[PDB]
């Protein structure tokens, strides 16, 4: 036999495994480390770059760049490092042995497809490849065929209504609000309590604060008033050097920015409004199904209470006749990869691959024509 490689590019993480695995074997941040200083000792290991968890371990000494910002690959030379490290070091598998499946956000600049393909065929010499829209895969992961999928990662937020196997492309909406920009806002607002994070490596300390402490308010303003009235919401966390920091009503204020992006200064409304407004773009006939099948996907959705808040706010905005239901698989951060596993393991899918012969004739333009 041969069993396909399935590999997901976020902005913050990379997830990869073989098709038919239950969950990816490799997860590590897509982060590239360079030194900032003179090497003191001759005979030390003199490394020119670090990748992923290595760069996590050494981050104090280093500059942590991200190759991907807003789902766009920004500098292809370090991206090549990310993939090379994935295939040889994490999976211990040569790409020439296995076809690969690669994951993309729906409106990203078209050139990203050609370049991402070209690196698989020329650099790794992958046998065959396909590229999938994240929201599509989330439906395979959740186990249904009609959904409006909301997904939000480190790089991008987007919605794609899918009805009974048919995507409805005009409905698609995308916001560049993401786990990264909640993090930068978290730095700005942390400054007000007196705790000040400047460097790239400090951002990841902030991000661990955000992941552990934050939560979503069910009434933002009533909890603001309560926390101003009472300490109990305040909670406290330990810097890597052992200093405690203690954090208050502000810890919810970052999740709130997704609903009220006017804080950061966006034009575009909160994800609840865009969700309803995207349903409005669809035909009336489908809408009853989508109001039940709200699917949340990608790690940014993991904030406790985001489901209850979303349901509450969209219910008030919905036509009262329709019930609203929301579905939040507890692993949903993985769900884009779980979906890409299901989809890559199907027998019917096999003919979909862009094969090395076909690319070699067609030129990387082929991705636009065949793949979508």
């Amino acid at each position: 036999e041969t069993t396909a490689l399935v590999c997901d590019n976020g902005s913050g993480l990379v997830k990869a495994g073989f098709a038919g695995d239950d969950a990816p074997r490799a997860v590590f941040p897509s982060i590239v480390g360079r030194p900032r200083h003179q090497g003191v000792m001759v005979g030390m290991g003199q490394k020119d770059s670090y990748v992923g968890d290595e760069a996590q371990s050494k981050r104090g000494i280093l500059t942590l760049k991200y190759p991907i910002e807003h789902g766009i690959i920004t500098n292809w030379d370090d991206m090549e490092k990310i993939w090379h490290h994935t295939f040889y070091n994490e999976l211990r598998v040569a790409p020439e042995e296995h076809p690969t499946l690669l994951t993309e956000a729906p409106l990203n600049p078209k050139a990203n497809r050609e370049k991402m393909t070209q690196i698989m065929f020329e650099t790794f010499n992958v046998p065959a490849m396909y590229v999938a829209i994240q929201a599509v895969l989330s439906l395979y992961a959740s186990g249904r065929t009609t959904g409006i999928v909301l997904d939000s990662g480190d790089g991008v937020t987007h919605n794609v209504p899918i009805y009974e196997g048919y995507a409805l492309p005009h409905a698609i909406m995308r916001l560049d609000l993401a786990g990264r920009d909640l993090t930068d806002y978290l730095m700005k607002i942390l400054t007000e309590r007196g705790y000040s994070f400047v460097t790239t490596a400090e951002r990841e300390i902030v991000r661990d604060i955000k992941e552990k402490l934050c939560y979503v308010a069910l009434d933002f303003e009533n909890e603001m008033a309560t926390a101003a009235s009472s300490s109990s919401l305040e909670k406290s966390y330990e810097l890597p050097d052992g200093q405690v920091i203690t954090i208050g009503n502000e810890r919810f204020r970052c999740p709130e920015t997704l609903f009220q992006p006017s804080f950061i200064g966006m034009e575009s409304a909160g994800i609840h409004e865009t969700t309803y407004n995207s349903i409005m773009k669809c035909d009336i006939d489908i809408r009853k199904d989508l109001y039940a099948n709200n699917v949340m996907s990608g790690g940014t959705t993991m904030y406790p209470g985001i489901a209850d808040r979303m349901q509450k706010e969209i219910t008030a905005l919905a036509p009262s006749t329709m019930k609203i239901k929301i579905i939040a698989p507890p692993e949903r951060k993985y769900s884009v990869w779980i979906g890409g596993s299901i989809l890559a393991s199907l027998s019917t899918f096999q003919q979909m691959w862009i094969t090395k012969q076909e690319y070699d004739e067609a030129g990387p333009s082929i991705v636009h024509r065949k793949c979508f």
Partner: peptide, 7 residues
């Protein structure tokens, strides 16, 4: 990106 945003 190339315009409306930094990437």
């Amino acid at each position: 990106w190339x315009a409306x945003c930094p990437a």
